[PDB]
């Protein structure tokens with residue numbers, strides 16, 4: 359069983375003159391991927407009671423959701439990203455009822471998931487991962503700006519896996535060489551780096567494993583990193599795939615998700631399986 363901890367988000371996308379509302383977030387994209395791939399999945403999130411109905415589709419995809427109360431729901435408009443509203447941060451109290459083999463920390467903004475909750479979770483679970491977005495994307499007068507993670511060298515040592523994209527990796531290392539940024543971030547003590555970039559995934563554990571995304575679509579990109587991380591965690595943690603095979607599996611799942619907007623769909627499983635997995 360896996361638990362995703364993170365804010366659901368009212369995503370506002372202004373693309374090609376059209377304003378789109380998406381009820382998403384890292385945890386929505388990751389949890390639907392793990393659940394559809396047949397791993398018992400739980401989400402711990404915060405939003406207003408009024409906004410809970412906007413995220414009902416999580417339960418439709420088999421995800422057990424703890425909708426903790428918040429006076430506000432997180433809302434992000436996207437190019438510059440603005441935190442319109444922020445739900446309440448997670449607390450040590452929220453970790454009390456943590457269940458399963460794995461927990462993935464998938465925050466949207468620095469301060470949503472306090473870094474000093476990482477050593478608390480470390481003691482509670484066998485496989486702990488986090489998404490860099492929640493530690494390098496910092497609200498400054500609403501504007502979400504990229505800032506280095508000052509305490510990365512203390513907390514990365516507690517993580518079995520750390521997810522970055524190109525912009526997050528460069529924020530953490532000062533280089534736009536994603537492979538070199540993988541070497542630098544692993545030297546901070548994270549056992550596995552999973553990096554997504556234009557049309558591919560790079561996984562580093564001391565050795566590099568690369569797989570390309572073979573599909574993409576106008577609005578298929580958002581959540582593809584969250585999807586890739588969840589697919590890798592299912593492959594590697596739950597299905598006992600080699601790091602190499604989990605990387606290829608992760609890329610295959612992400613590719614099918616990138617054919618359409620929103621999270622992985624049950625109808626995507628046929629395309630993903632390739633008459634091999636399920």
Ligand SMILES: [Mg+2]
Pocket residue numbers: 489491522523583584
């Ligand atoms: Mg991401």
